[PDB]
Design a protein around this ligand. Sequence first.
Ligand SMILES: Cc1ncc(C[n+]2csc(CCOP(=O)(O)OP(=O)(O)O)c2C)c(N)n1
Ligand SMILES: [Mg+2]
Length: 525
Amino acid sequence: ASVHGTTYELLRRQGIDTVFGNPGFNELPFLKDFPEDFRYILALQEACVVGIADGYAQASRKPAFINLHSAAGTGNAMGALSNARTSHSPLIVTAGQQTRAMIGVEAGETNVDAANLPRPLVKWSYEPASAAEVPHAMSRAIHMASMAPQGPVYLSVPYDDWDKDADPQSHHLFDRHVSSSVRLNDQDLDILVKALNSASNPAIVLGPDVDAANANADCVMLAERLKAPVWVAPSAPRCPFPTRHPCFRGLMPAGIAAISQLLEGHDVVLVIGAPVFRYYQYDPGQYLKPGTRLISVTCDPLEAARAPMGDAIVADIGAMASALANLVEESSRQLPTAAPEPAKVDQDAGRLHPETVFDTLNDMAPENAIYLNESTSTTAQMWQRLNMRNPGSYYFCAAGGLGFALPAAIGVQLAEPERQVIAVIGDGSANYSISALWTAAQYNIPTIFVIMNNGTYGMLRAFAGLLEAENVPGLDVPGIDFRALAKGYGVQALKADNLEQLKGSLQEALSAKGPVLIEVSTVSP
Ligand SMILES: Cc1ncc(C[n+]2csc(CCOP(=O)(O)OP(=O)(O)O)c2C)c(N)n1
Ligand SMILES: [Mg+2]
């Protein structure tokens, strides 16, 4: 009968059993009487709350539910919501509002013009006009988050609403099923399949929505049937393909001219689940060389509209990948040759080269490990050196916003308790969401954090070189003791100053029953 009771019934009926949150005054009437079939995951700062929720939703491929405090709690999470937008993460962000009777006077903790604060990062944002409509607004939020293209949504709820009577008609919300598992009509799909079958030198480019859809295995069958090389689209937030499969060609360069040069000679380039393209450095040139046609399958109208070249189909990635994989003819061409083994770099018995750490991780980690990357200057080496053969094995801040991997690795590990999660994070990136470590300690979530400590924002110094930007301040972060910080939050703390210490401490961390942070001294660039 109460809005509180009806809303938790709607959540449980829609598959939700976990609330990620940091509490406040406005949220106490929502969180009180907390149901025994739900669990509450506390984090100490809201960027950490949302990052944990985000990794959990991406790994579990289902929506995550979040409860923050009013404007200041929502505002603390806006960086994390920037990443969630670009990863298409289905996050239901709720926040408590002041009692309806004092919103106009703007009492303390009032979220002023609340629906505008999340924008423009969310796909829907709303504050209900009455308590009895809160379950309906929750239902809208749940489905807006889950419908393709998935993404974060925001709901602001005045705290006096929870005790009020819910609309009796709200029960019709509980079991609603909304599908967007759609694909191109048969006639046009046959034209596309005919164009793929008849390409003499096709190429495939895969983006994060493939891994989100668990379309990986169908994309493998597609690449094998067309005998086609496979790249992952630049600035990759996820891994959509086994990285040691013979077709895999790794991470594309993030420049306009670099990409059209690599494409040159491929007559049909099929892009699935990816923006066209997430360029980074400005590398002006031709978008495509003559003789290359590009076709993009995307779950997101905005991606289809913003591409500067190619044709596009707006459809569900799982349904389209499955349909294409089963319809294309087996080409008589020879399968592409696997990329060469990465080489061992020179390693003396002191500070570690990043290449060495990736090679050791690849040797020792389980074959179904899950990795997260926030070591920004070593991303290329990481993609070359980690054999990720299974789906959901890689996460990287989708919008480039640091502060994702440390909390996200906790959420992934929570969602996949049978797969060892290993977050490789630079010493600069580690600080943005450092307090997330406490959640791993308190809930005994056994994520492994590998801190790559070279004392500087290495990626920025390299980019500065690219931009001929000299005498830039703020690029060095000396004087951080990551073992002490780990201890501060109750997380076991190891160090690795050479290769033998690295091997030993990783093997310890694998066997450890709790979370473990390993501080690795890496070479300064
Ligand atoms: C929230 C946020 N603030 C700042 C940046 C800019 N940024 C991009 S890479 C980087 C350096 C990260 O340093 P570290 O994690 O130590 O790795 P390294 O580059 O040395 O491998 C910074 C500050 C960003 N992307 N996001
Ligand atoms: Mg660094």
